[model samples]
Target: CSSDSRYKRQVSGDEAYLEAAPLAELHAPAGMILPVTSGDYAIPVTNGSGAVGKALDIR
Candidate 1:
């Protein structure tokens, strides 16, 4: 569990440490769908290193 003042020990390391969960900021159109293959059914890819890798040269 996490304390009210400090970061939660239960969630840390890599993406676990990432703030802003549930992706509350992702306010897209009503019919919008995240990307798994750059398509409507796909969800957007997240994660620092993984995203960079996929964007830079994951293919």
Candidate 2:
């Protein structure tokens, strides 16, 4: 299911196997990473109207 051809023979699922397996593959979703400017930062989850429903404060 990965886009990388290097991971074509890699096995999927089984967290235990994946953790101990000697394969190097990217198992994460491709996305842009926003740099955190400071330690005092928060990740807020907003609703449909852009109202913050919940937030995770990292300080």
Candidate 3:
């Protein structure tokens, strides 16, 4: 007899391949991560507005 639900989502099947299953409860989108710091921003480092003596060269 194919033993009752070797796994679930609520669903499954049993086989010798299922290897007598028992290791499933590890889920939060899978390995768990839910944006706790939910908010945006970053860009600090640029100098020129002091009108620092123009070395503004690009070749």
Where does candidate 2 clash, by residue pair?
none
lDDT of 1 by residue, 1-59 (tens): 57566442332244543443464356567689664335475555555454322133321
Error of 1 at 19 (Å): 9.2
lDDT on C-alpha atoms for all candidate structures: 0.44, 0.40, 0.38
Write candidate 3's Cα lDDT for 4-58 as tens digits. 7653231123333223335465345855765532346332434425322223222
RMSD of each: 13.5, 19.6, 27.4
Rank ordering of all candidates by TM-score, starting from the highest:
1, 2, 3
Instruction: State the displacement of the C-alpha of residue 18, model 2, in Å, after optimal TM-score superposition.
Output: 37
Q: Model 1, stretches more than 4 Å misplaced? A: 1-24, 35-59
Better of 2 and 3 by TM-score: 2
CA shift at 55, candidate 1, in angstroms?
Answer: 39
Candidate 3: where is the Cα deviation over 4 Å?
Answer: 1-41, 46-53
Give the per-residue Cα lDDT of candidate 1 at 3.
Answer: 50
